[PDB]
Amino acid sequence: DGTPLGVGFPVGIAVDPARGKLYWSDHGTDSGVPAKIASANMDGTSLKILFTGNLQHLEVVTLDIQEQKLYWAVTSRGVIERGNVDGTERMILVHHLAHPWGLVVYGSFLYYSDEQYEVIERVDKSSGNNKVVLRDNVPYLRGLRVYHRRNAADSSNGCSNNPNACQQICLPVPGGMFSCACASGFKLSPDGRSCSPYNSFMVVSMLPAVRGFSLELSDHSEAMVPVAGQGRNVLHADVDVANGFIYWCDFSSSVRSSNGIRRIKPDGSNFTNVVTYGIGANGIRGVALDWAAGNLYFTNAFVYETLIEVLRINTTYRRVLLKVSVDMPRHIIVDPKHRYLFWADYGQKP
């Protein structure tokens, strides 16, 4: 979102199972989130900005759980830095690196790989000091990790103490508590444990995909399983609240059969083509659904003609209402309450 607390361009992730806090490194966005090191509860509740400053080409972040200090690398300055999770103490650990890509802290040593030096090096986690080379002349180096024994007994939280507490997803929070979550397109029930479909949300349609966002701005989750993938080029979308459907019209100038009107439930099921036959040279340029009578209104946009059509849902009856040549209706909204149709025209004589 517009606030600095949101994710701008997240690169790395570190998780602290006990004490329940996420940590991530962000490249920032223009006129929005800065490039910063941020932290939040693993359910996403309390966004926070820990370190901001000379970070430009920020690399992945990592966490030393035993010492509770964050590590990250800045390519624009060629350094590896440390910082407490409190966001207070910050210092430079290694100098004169070329392009750090991955780094990991285990035991008393810190391992980092430089993609431009084509090397993997080990240094102490308190300071550079004893530099040791593990591999050299290795091209295309990337991130690193240490495979080691960590058990559920050495650290525990709410989601481990209470299995089967949440029906779909359990997310720990600081203090030993746990927060239940319900997938995508589902909303947490008032009991706090079960799941129900997202009764109230808003629909935004992009050319690549159709997505749903909740009205309450504190909820960053997707309120609807996104409609995306190959063959998607969305011009408009309309909703059917009672029957639980979302109608959208695809467009394609070159490839046919990519034109028409489709339907889908907000949970991602029962995909079905509604209108496929008789689409004009320019696709369906507008869609409007009459939730009272069950009528669907849409606009066909031929090269020199424009039709306004009706289709009764779950029914093959399809009718043309208007045929115009000098006027070009484009976007249709229907009002069953006052029984009117309003459409916008942006051709000659708008």
Partner 1 sequence: XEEXX
Ligand X SMILES: *[C@@H]1O[C@H](CO)[C@@H](O)[C@H](O)[C@H]1NC(C)=O
Ligand Y SMILES: *[C@@H]1O[C@H](CO)[C@@H](O[C@@H]2O[C@H](CO)[C@@H](O[C@@H]3O[C@H](CO[C@H]4O[C@H](CO)[C@@H](O)[C@H](O)[C@@H]4O)[C@@H](O)[C@H](O[C@H]4O[C@H](CO)[C@@H](O)[C@H](O)[C@@H]4O)[C@@H]3O)[C@H](O)[C@H]2NC(C)=O)[C@H](O)[C@H]1NC(C)=O
Residues lying near Ni ion in the complex (CB under 5 A): 75
The one segment of 31-39, 149-157, 221-229, 282-290 that binds a second copy by CB under 8 A:
31-39
Backbone angles phi, psi at 161, to 5 degrees: -70, -30
Partners of 227 in beta bridges: 210
Which residues, in sequence order, are CB contacts of 156 under 8 Å at separation 6+? 18
Going residue by residue from 212 to 251, which x/- string records binding to ligand Y, judged by CB under 6 A? -------------------------------xx-------
Residue nearest to Ca ion (CB): 137
For 96-100, the CB contacts below 8 A with 24+ separation are 97/73, 99/75, 100/59, 100/73, 100/75
CA 163, CA 178: separation in Å to the nearest integer?
A: 11
User: 3-state secondary structure string, 43-82?
Assistant: CCCCCEEEEECCCCCEEEEEEECCCCEEEEEECCCCEEEE
Is 169:182 a contact under the CB 8 Å cutoff? yes
Nearer to ligand Y, 68 or 270 (CB): 270
Residue nearest to ligand Y (CB): 243
User: Taking CB within 5 to 8 Å according to partner kind, which of Ni ion, ligand Y, a second copy, none is near residue 149?
Assistant: none
Nearer to partner 1, 176 or 347 (CB): 347
The one segment of 136-144, 166-174, 216-224, 327-335 that binds Ca ion by CB under 5 A:
136-144
Residue 269 binds Ca ion (CB under 5 A): no
CA 215, CA 207: separation in Å to the nearest integer?
A: 22
Contacting ligand X (CB under 6 A), which of 127, 270, 276, 315? 270
Contacting ligand X (CB under 6 A), which of 164, 230, 269, 314? 269
Contacting a second copy (CB under 8 A), which of 68, 76, 243, 253? 76
Q: Which of residues 328-347 bind ligand Y (CB under 6 A)?
A: none
In the complex, the smallest distance separating the C-beta of residue 35 from ligand X, rounded to whole angstroms, is 44
Amino acid, single-letter form, for residue 323: K
Residue 137 binds Ca ion (CB under 5 A): yes
Residue 6 binds ligand Y (CB under 6 A): no
CA 328, CA 305: separation in Å to the nearest integer?
A: 8
Nearer to ligand Y, 8 or 294 (CB): 294
Coil, strand or helix: which one is 161?
A: helix
The one segment of 46-54, 105-113, 251-259, 268-276 that binds partner 1 by CB under 8 A:
251-259
Q: How is residue 249 written in tokens?
A: 């019209």
**CB neighbours of residue 262 within 10 Å:** 22
Nearer to ligand X, 88 or 269 (CB): 269
User: Taking CB within 5 to 8 Å according to partner kind, which of Ni ion, ligand Y, a second copy, none is near residue 314?
Assistant: ligand Y
For 279-283, the CB contacts below 8 A with 24+ separation are 280/305, 280/306, 280/307, 282/251, 282/253, 283/235, 283/249, 283/250, 283/251, 283/252, 283/259
Name the site residues for partner 1 (rule: CB under 8 A). Answer: 207-208, 233, 235, 251-254, 282, 285, 301, 303
Name the site residues for ligand X (rule: CB under 6 A). Answer: 269-270
